[PDB]
Amino acid sequence: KVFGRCELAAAMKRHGLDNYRGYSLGNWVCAAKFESNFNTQATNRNTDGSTDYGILQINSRWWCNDGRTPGSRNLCNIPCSALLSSDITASVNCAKKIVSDGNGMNAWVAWRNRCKGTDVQAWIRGCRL
Ligand SMILES: [Cl-]
Ligand SMILES: [Cl-]
Ligand code: NA
Q1: Nearest to 43 by CA among 74, 20, 66
Q2: Per the residue annotation, which of 18, 48, 52, 119 is the catalytic one?
Q3: N or C: which end of the chain has fewer CB within 10 A?
Q4: C-alpha distances in angstroms, 28 versus 32, 53, 69, 114, 116?
Q5: Which CATH number does the domain housing residue 66 bear?
């Protein structure tokens, strides 16, 4: 599923992400735009052989099982394929664990480089929430 901007914002707010660990909703929408272009089916292979999955590009080296990243962990206890669903519940729940792990949203490279320090409220401007 390719989300609209305000549609995704409402779903994330309906999933508890607004101000989660201090990150306003616009941070999460900005991250999803530049990680996946709001596409739940996005995948990208990394040099080390791990793969990133879904609307927030969660990496199989630590967070999910895809059967093809030897020596990796599955800290969200899910198959990586579950992160590609049109229902974003599994991605949101796993993102809550990532952002709690000490490094905040710096875990998402595109957030650090394209969202951090910008007017992220602009990403939810005009949405009914
Ligand atoms: Cl915001
Ligand atoms: Cl933080
Ligand atoms: Na894994």
Answers
A1: 66
A2: 52
A3: C
A4: 6, 16, 27, 12, 11
A5: 1.10.530.10
Listed as own residue / partner, the contacts of 122-126 with beta carbons closer than 8 Å and 24 or more positions apart are 122/26, 123/5, 123/9, 123/26, 123/29, 123/30, 123/33, 124/6, 124/9, 124/25, 124/26, 124/29, 126/6
Please tell me the distance from the alpha carbon of residue 108 to that of residue 23, in angstroms, as a whole number.
13
Of 18, 35, 48, 119, the active-site residue reads 35
Please confirm, yes or no, whether 35 is among the known catalytic residues. Answer: yes
**Sheet with 51-53, edge to edge strand ranges:** 43-45, 51-53, 58-59
- The residues whose Cβ lies within 5 A of ligand 3, an ion, are 60, 65, 69, 72, 74
Tally of structural domains, the chain = 1
Whether 101 has a binding-site annotation, put simply, is yes
Contact by Cβ (8 Å): 28, 124: no
From CA 56, how far away is CA 90, in angstroms rounded? Answer: 11
Chain center to CA of 76: 13
Q: Is 87 a catalytic residue?
A: no
